[PDB]
Symmetry: C7
């Protein structure tokens, strides 16, 4: 797709920590915009585990391929994929990472993953009201299996968090989300799950035909995360 | 020693702290707006306990149902339900939770619930005047039975707190409240109370006919809180 | 005589700290407005004590009656009634409560009540010039009997303080104040004092006929404060 | 591709800690306005002491008379009288008080009163330049006998201090000062001194005929301050 | 970018930490501009190492030649080059230096270079959201061989980081990046690699014919960095 | 929403720590203006010492004459005279005083007076750049005899310091400085020196004829400062 | 003109730490201007040393000649000359002096003079980005001989530093720099070096014919600095 920023003027500039007369945080709103322009990714609970899949859209030959990993591990049993401002995502991810370690070193085990996400969420929410500082313009989803079972959560710049059966984020959210909204199959076995997924991913962003090379990872109850190899993903491609 | 935040290294530019020529905190007003756009919930004292009921309006098949719990526990004998900016509600809930724990660990027992709400209220009141920081865009109600007996309180973004015999909050407040204002029956036994309630909740938000699946829980003097199961609630539905 | 510096800069660009070209603090003025929009109340010295009386105007049946106490106790011998921003009023009261305890624990006795009011006044005054922080939108009057005798003080958002023989505050101030200004009887015995008072309160806010249920408390030299029970006040009503 | 002095003068931005292009601190100017609107008072050295006198203009019968003391003791040998924002005045006075005690506990004796006033003035001067904070809107005069002998000083919102033979402050300054400037008698004996003063006070504010009840206090070398009782003052009245 | 830019004042930027209504950080944008106006430089992986090359464009005879080193060493095994605000670049370079030592002293060895750059990047990222502080108007590329093997990354004012097979930075970025994008040869042996590079650099900035004297350095797996001598560089020139 | 309020806007910026497009600090300039409107004073090295002389322009009879000292001692061998904002002068003077003592207590002797001034000068220079603070609106001249010999220095609000043979400051600076500029006699003997001075001072400010009573003091190498008595000065007058 | 200000401009676009849409720091730019309006000075490496030369332009006979030293020592082997805001220059110089002592006291010897300048540069650079603080309006050049040999560096308000063979600064920079740029002789022996210099300085600022009295100092490898005496320079003049 063609790229270019026609707008270069500051234009309208509200302020920070100010509700609009209609009860809205415009800054948090503008933040959301940034994440809409991000890459597209999704994940869904299946058989006895959960998978993650993102559209790895590459440009130059000169990029170090794989090095542009979109799906990142926070720990062997839990990962997250993100979209929006790259820098903000990164730092936010590292926070989750250490945060995860903390619970492990104090309680001896990350029993409930829901909690890990709540913390990073709270981090984000702080910037939503604490005066002099810019909100994190990134949305990300955590998924993996904890003591309770296979889990999937998403988080937006406002610090909002929810649990899904399946969901997506980034540019093609609306599209891909609708596809699942209709064709999502409950206890779909992995092989088919990834299929339904890649299909859904396709339809969405695939206004531009070529799906390119998606990045896919999955974890099933009982064991650690598995990242699909170039060939394995291409198989479903 | 004085209670306050040591962190003050960060400089603050713009800040909320201006009374209008007519004696009003516009920021706190704008905040109130955000809560009106929140879901609808209510509660009321009855026979020998109190109950809480929230309208659990769901969208996608892809959401993890129950996980979107609106009625949250503070402790086995006190629960609260909130309305407004979701993020703000969550963080304000956890504050009350630990704050609750604190009274328990020093005094050995949370004797007066009124006090619990007062603390969380004051928290909110602080952002009402301390310059550089956006107020909490949320309102909530605490319900439970304490040393004094079944108690019902509500709280707005201004930090204003009041005890009720029955009340509501969120979107259809004015509506549902009027129904009760009219048909509220003093010592209505639980079964009939939950009914009157659900009826009241219906009328209000029910401009859109379908009541969907309401979330209801109750507690009665002498014991801990009881969350109604899917079928039980569907029974009154 | 060396002294360390916690903050490198004494202060930066902040609001709420500007004299109008005519020598007035407009914010403090606007703050006063909000208090004008509060409930009406008054107090007056009599025979050998002082009494406080406030108009308890109630709305819904759903309100927990008494729980909406306007006359508050700071200590068995000193009570205060407030008008203006409710949240602000509360927080200010608690400050006065602990502050009272403070003098007690150090000197072993609250010898002069004037001093207690001065301390809470100063608290208010600070927000009058210390930049980034909104003034307390509330006024209140303290009454009780100290080492000197029965005492009646009032205090506005400015932090201004005066001692009266009789006075009122809130919405119907100018009105009720005129009434006393005219028909206030110096050493009026209690029964008659409460009469003159209630009559005064009535005349004032009673543009709307029904006085409703007034909240009244009285203390006399030698003993602790006495709050009037529903029937007793209704007797004068 | 060219630079020059396009703007002769810089446009006005804020107002706190900003010199006007004519080298004036407008804020401090406005402050002064506030003091013009305050009550009128004066003081003058006499035979072997100095005296203070302030116009105690009372309104309602409901005010606790004397309690509205305008002349305030800093210590048995030094008093002060104030004019301007009443709250600001009070807090400043107490500062003067603790400060006076400070010198006494370290040096064992307040040898030179000039110093005392120097410290309070420096207090005010600080608010004249330290960014975020509104200046004290008040002007006061200190009088009392010290190691050097009877002394009289005045202080304005700018932190300016001077010693007079006689002077005044408040509303009718210009008027009263002129009267003295003309008929002031060098070593006038107390009785005639207080007369010359009350007359001077009269003329000034006495556009409105009734001098009402003045407040007068005096000290003479060798002993402690004396406040005139109602009858005594009424005698010169 | 042509110097024919339109001169103007500052935009309507209230403070640095505002998202535009389109989800963009304008300040970070403006910073990027500053980098485009810097010198041109590049680097690329080759045979068994990596090389760096920057256009050392000199003016006066009075400059101390070599002293204007654009290629700087962070450690014998890692170098970096920069473009944009010189001052910002330098400070940024030293941080990286000390940062590198720290890793060395705690772990005993700089195992993965990606981490080093990550640290310097997060530094910049901070100034992207933390209020009162101007972002680093600079972009730099780190290159050298670590535990994994030869590595090359780039970093911009936004703190965004990527690893390349080859890439450039500064003024003629777009031009030279294209050249390589087309004629870049995978495992090109040093001598030819430096040639392809110098040709690419030439083409790019060489609108003004003379390539002048380029600054080039290269390291290979197994040993320390080697900076080319004047004569050696002139050989490829 | 929005009843109709939108005309008024809230915003805060800077205008003190801001260079003009032409390279000048408007605030410091404005500061200078304030000093121009101050009293006129001068000083000049003579035979074997230095003398200071200020025009003590008095108004009302009610002022305490001498107490309005314009020439102030810093230590028995060094004095200074100031002009500009009275309040800022004083505080600044005291700073020099303790600053003087400091060197004495550490090195045992104030060897070089030039250093003393540099310190008070730096204090001033600091407020020229440190944001949130209004510069000192004053200029002064330091004179006395140090280890090197008789010295004379001047200092302005900007923190600029120069040593002179003779100079003046205040209102009629330009005038008096010119008279000297022409008729200044190098090693003029005291009696004549004070004459040349008074003459020079006269001419300048003497557009208004009457020189009134000048304040003069002089010190000569080998001993302490001498302040001229009313009659003595009157002799040259 | 009036108590009320006609302009309601609460804030303006001009501020600090803001990149312009074209990537420039306007504040740093304006700072440069002020250095342009400063005196003119230069330096150049010669035979086996380096020399400094500044135009000591004097006004009144009343100035203390030599006392206005423009060339200042940091230590017997390194001196610097500055141009721009005098006050800023001074404090900046003292910083480098103590800064030098620091290295000497820790390492036992100032090995590389480049480091010294770099430290003073970073100090400067900080005010380039740390929000609330005006940048240093001054540039200076350091010259001396260190462990590497004779060295010459220049430094601007931006914190940019460069080593030269010869250079100048201040008002007539461009002028004198060109002269050198053309007639500068590499290993010119001192006597001739100073000549080429004085001639160069002359040509430049000498639009006004009279070169007045130039201030010149030089050092040669192997020994300490030598400042030329009035007559010696007059010999070259």
């Amino acid at each position: 797709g063609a790229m270019g920023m026609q707008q270069g003027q500051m234009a309208y500039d509200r302020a920070i920590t100010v509700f609009s007369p209609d009860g809205r945080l415009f800054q948090v709103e503008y933040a959301r915009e940034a994440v809409k322009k991000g890459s597209t990714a999704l994940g869904m609970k299946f058989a006895n585990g959960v998978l993650l899949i993102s559209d790895k859209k590459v440009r130059s030959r000169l990029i170090e391929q794989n090095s542009i990993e979109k799906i990142q591990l926070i720990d062997d049993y839990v990962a997250a994929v993100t979209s929006g401002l790259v820098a903000d995502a990164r730092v936010l991810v590292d926070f989750a990472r250490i945060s995860a370690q903390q619970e492990k070193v104090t309680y001896g085990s990350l029993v409930n993953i829901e909690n890990l996400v709540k913390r990073v969420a709270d981090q984000m929410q702080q910037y939503t009201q604490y005066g002099g500082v810019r909100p994190y313009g990134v949305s990300l989803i955590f998924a993996g299996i904890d003591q309770i079972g296979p889990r999937l959560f998403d988080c937006d710049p406002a610090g909002t968090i929810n649990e899904y059966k399946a969901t997506a984020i980034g540019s093609g959210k609306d599209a891909v989300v609708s596809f699942l909204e209709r064709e999502y199959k409950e206890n779909l076995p992995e092989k088919e799950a990834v299929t339904l997924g890649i299909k859904a991913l396709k339809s969405s962003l695939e206004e531009g035909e070529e799906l390119k090379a998606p990045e896919i990872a999955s974890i099933t109850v009982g064991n650690k995360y598995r990242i699909y190899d170039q060939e394995e993903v291409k198989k479903f491609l």
